[PDB]
Design an enzyme around this catalytic site. Sequence first.
Site, PDB file in Angstrom:
ATOM      1  N   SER C 386       0.862  -1.180   0.000  1.00 45.20           N
ATOM      2  CA  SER C 386       0.000   0.000   0.000  1.00 45.20           C
ATOM      3  C   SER C 386       0.897   1.229   0.000  1.00 45.20           C
ATOM      4  CB  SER C 386      -0.938   0.013   1.200  1.00 45.20           C
ATOM      5  OG  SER C 386      -2.046   0.861   0.961  1.00 45.20           O
ATOM      6  N   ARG C 387       1.014   1.879  -1.156  1.00 46.67           N
ATOM      7  CA  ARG C 387       2.020   2.910  -1.367  1.00 46.67           C
ATOM      8  C   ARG C 387       1.645   4.273  -0.808  1.00 46.67           C
ATOM      9  NH1 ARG C 387       4.229   1.166  -7.426  1.00 46.67           N
ATOM     10  NH2 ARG C 387       3.094  -0.828  -7.338  1.00 46.67           N
ATOM     11  N   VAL C 388       0.504   4.407  -0.135  1.00 47.48           N
ATOM     12  CA  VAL C 388       0.364   5.551   0.758  1.00 47.48           C
ATOM     13  C   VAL C 388       0.997   5.244   2.112  1.00 47.48           C
ATOM     14  CG1 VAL C 388      -1.649   6.396  -0.466  1.00 47.48           C
ATOM     15  CG2 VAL C 388      -1.971   4.904   1.478  1.00 47.48           C
TER      16      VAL C 388
END
Lengths: 193, 52, 520, 242, 122, 21
Positions: C386-388
């Site tokens: 999850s790149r946030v």
Amino acid sequence: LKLPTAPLQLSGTSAQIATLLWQVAAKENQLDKVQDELYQFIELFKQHSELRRLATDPFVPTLVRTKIISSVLKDSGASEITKKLFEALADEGALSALLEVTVNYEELMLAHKKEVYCTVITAEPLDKLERVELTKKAEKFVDAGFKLVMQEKIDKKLLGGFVIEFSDRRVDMSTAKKVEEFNNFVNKLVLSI
Amino acid sequence: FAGVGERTREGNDLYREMIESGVIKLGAERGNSKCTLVYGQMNEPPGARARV
Amino acid sequence: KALDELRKPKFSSKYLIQHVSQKLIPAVKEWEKSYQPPVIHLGRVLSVGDGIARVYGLKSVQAGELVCFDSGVKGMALNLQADHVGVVVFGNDSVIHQGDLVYRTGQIVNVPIGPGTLGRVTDGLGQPIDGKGPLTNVRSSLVEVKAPGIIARQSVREPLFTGVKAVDALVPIGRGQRELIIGDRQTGKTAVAIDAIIHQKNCNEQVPKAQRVYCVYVAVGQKRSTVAQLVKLFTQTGAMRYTIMVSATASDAAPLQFLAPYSGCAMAEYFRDTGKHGLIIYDDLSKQSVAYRQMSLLLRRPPGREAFPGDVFYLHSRLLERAAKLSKELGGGSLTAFPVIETQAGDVSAYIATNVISITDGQIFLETELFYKGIRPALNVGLSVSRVGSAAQFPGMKQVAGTLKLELAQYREVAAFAQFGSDLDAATQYVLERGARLTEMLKQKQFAPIPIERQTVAVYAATKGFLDKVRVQDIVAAEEAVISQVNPAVFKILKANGKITPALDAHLKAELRKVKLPGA
Amino acid sequence: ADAKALDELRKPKFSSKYLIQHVSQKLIPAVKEWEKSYQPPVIHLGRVLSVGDGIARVYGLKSVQAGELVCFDSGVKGMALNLQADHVGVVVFGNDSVIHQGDLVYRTGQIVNVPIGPGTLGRVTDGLGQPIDGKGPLTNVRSSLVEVKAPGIIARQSVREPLFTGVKAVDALVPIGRGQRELIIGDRQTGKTAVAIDAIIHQKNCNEQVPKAQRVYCVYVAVGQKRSTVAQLVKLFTQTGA
Amino acid sequence: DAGYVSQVIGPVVDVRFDGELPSILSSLEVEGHSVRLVLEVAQHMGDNTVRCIAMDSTDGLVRGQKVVDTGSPIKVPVGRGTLGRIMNVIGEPVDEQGPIDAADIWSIHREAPEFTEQSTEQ
Amino acid sequence: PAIDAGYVSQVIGPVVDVRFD
Ligand SMILES: Nc1ncnc2c1ncn2[C@@H]1O[C@H](COP(=O)(O)OP(=O)(O)OP(=O)(O)O)[C@@H](O)[C@H]1O
Ligand SMILES: Nc1ncnc2c1ncn2[C@@H]1O[C@H](COP(=O)(O)OP(=O)(O)OP(=O)(O)O)[C@@H](O)[C@H]1O
Ligand SMILES: [Mg+2]
Ligand SMILES: [Mg+2]
């Protein structure tokens, strides 16, 4: 909107132009005028080089080709059909399709003129009782009320008789094939009996 | 920075991060900026993504 | 011979007779009095077939312009060739004949968007099929729009609470990113998306109007009975007043399945352009890529890998890039996309799967091996990114999520050593049993979304050992006992304050000591 | 459609002359008035019919040899690989952007030549033989074909004399003869160019110890590498003396 | 002088010029479009027609729309004026801070430098 | 019955083409 039906169906994309040309010139009843005009254009392509340069060169612009075909075909009593045909065929570079649109048009007109061709190839020059007896036996191969014409060719390989060349069927009533089927019928029995 | 065909979101994140760190300067102090962003992110059709 | 150069024809066109017949049929003298079909704004169908019509005429048509046949069925002019127009058909192509007229409408493809779209089971073109009448409080916007630029976005801050414990702790989802749910067939993908919708019904009655989330579910290529069951389910929970059901099913035509996620994205971008929050689930995006593959292969385009066209990356790129968190100058709205890509027996190295994984920020890899281990949802915690990250993770959940990730990281490597029953280490056994506690903690029944505060309390009670005394087989009910037997004040202040304060972590530390666990 | 119904139009069959007589006098001023919008017709020359992705399809060129260096009027050379029925498909040695639809293509009468000889020893040429190190044109050199025939069975003897590479594993395990085609295979960044350059430097070192007939002169062929890697190899060979 | 669009397929647009075709890699401007569309000539088709690739979306192109040649590749505003700005692919400001100052305007297509002009300094 | 009686144009295996007037 109401176009008369062509007598024989044909192929696509060059025979369709001939089908439409026969339909339009049969609506106008100029069916032998435009055949003469297409023959004249075939020989006109044969004569000069600046006209076949309008159909084989891929670097001529379409504007000068359209204006040349319009300004040439403005006069000399040309039909409206052949004029608008050559305008539409020069606008799209389809002048090289003339040689195979006129053949399908000739096949269509030969279907209509109710005249089928033949070619009888023989060994001797035919005499007048040989010819009028030939027409009665060759008419039994046509299939309706037609105008089967009889062409003559002379070839020494046949030992008498005749071979009919209808361009789609062949009747070999010659003696040179009669003796050729004779010698094949004997040797199938000598190996058996 | 020639950002070729990545997400638009990380391009906006890079632009805000270089706003706040002092690399890209807006307003009248623009002459002291030391980075030119070039963005060809994923939204654009592939001619733009091929030439960015 | 001088005749040989003109022997064989060299055509620059295919429909040459169609251009000749627009100039020979006026050469008849009786057919000059308006005996000509116009092709400036009309069009005649040359060849129909397989939901593809090739139209001669349409000189003033635009690429991507919705044209209408005279049979009533509509179509999109897609290939604008030099001598004809390749027009796809939005319906059955049995109603089209050669020689029919094509009337262009001058409009690029339009769908009714607005506040009246809520609760309306519509197609990928805009007609509602639920039998409640036409769309009333709507307006007609474009289907294919330009994605927002680099100025138009801001940083993804606020979280989008999913209600699933396996994803809200490990793979957190903020309001405005694109999170992919990739898996195999019957692994739990649609169920995770439905839990993400039903938790918005559980959440929207507690937040103000600017923080509500309006879901849009885009069923592409599914059955009609599946969408009927889903409409029955969303009405049985009452979440249809937040949900738009865009449905181009498997009976519907291939350009309808192709344009269904675009139509849904246009119907969900209305809340993004008006300061509200939106959530869109392009369900079965692989079937949308299959429908685009069919629509392109019947349009004579050269195929590539797996017979897909070249621009099928662009197909999902220009669809997914419209999901963003806008800045405060443009309303502060958001659209959170949820693509769903089905893999075939775990080949994640396919074409469409790698393209959508390359586009989206997160990924939720649901595996069919861990689905039958009892772990439902079947979230493979190793491959899911999850790149946030912790930028949009819920505070309080951030205090225990690092511990959860690290302990499950050690439990993922303690495997291939538990098959030797006498081989005790007393330190790998502790992490080996702790991983079983945390793994069986994160189970959920379907259609049962848990609020985020109860999730944080329930995972706090497991990462700190307050369910460590029980066996490995009774944690599915001890979780519910821990949720029920604590004070209701703990969730009530944990939802409101935003984080586990030092003025609360001594209360529920003791409230887990007055609990009854079914095992000791 | 057939040929049998198409050969029979070679004989004249008009039976009227009301078209071919009049327009035969009109056609010549009609093609005179559009003399400006023509291009001069190419028979033994070549005109570019189309161009794309470094491939120009050239109409004309009636007497090219398959594989002949054609030279465009832009100054860029080409190589007629495939000869079609109506056009010639040539390749483009360099920038394809300086070739438009309608350029002239002149054939050179040369199967593709490269300058070979003693004078090119020590030079950095491109793939056509032209030097890129830039110290003047090639002197004491002569052109030869790039596609000569390989020597046959009588023209070869047995590989006996050994080629020392200077690498210990090559000379100890997989020894190279002096007429041996030997592949240096592997993955990326494993040291294939390392074994290559070590062999070249060792033939330099051994060439200053053998008497004048066992001197082996290396040749390096860099295909598809960087300009900086070839410049690094040039600086390396010049600082060694190779 | 100006040519018209002949064929639109995907992001690829076939533009038909009547006389004096543009070169390969040349930049073409479509006139009449809503958003500023820029075409780049990829190849010459062969019948006074080039085949371009579109920088923006081809949704809204009509066959016959007049396309004017710029006689050069895609020219971008370059220099000190671009610092802190976000340029487009065709060189347009997308950071919404106004137009770009222009030191020089350079075409984006050019050559690799040379073999001679290199630095072997590691 | 000239109209609404088409003829077989071509046959490629189990695929038959009929051409109509
Ligand atoms: N939390 C859960 N607990 C128990 N069962 C679940 C849970 N989540 C999903 N399931 C079961 O797993 C199945 C998931 O099916 P799903 O809706 O994912 O179909 P799909 O994989 O999206 O598509 P397809 O039908 O093509 O496989 C459902 O039948 C549901 O009963
Ligand atoms: N025998 C060796 N001892 C020490 N280092 C070596 C040896 N051989 C190669 N190397 C080092 O390995 C690196 C890669 O070598 P080299 O460039 O030959 O690989 P390569 O196969 O040519 O890679 P590429 O084909 O991608 O250029 C070089 O930096 C070189 O210094
Ligand atoms: Mg499903
Ligand atoms: Mg190497």
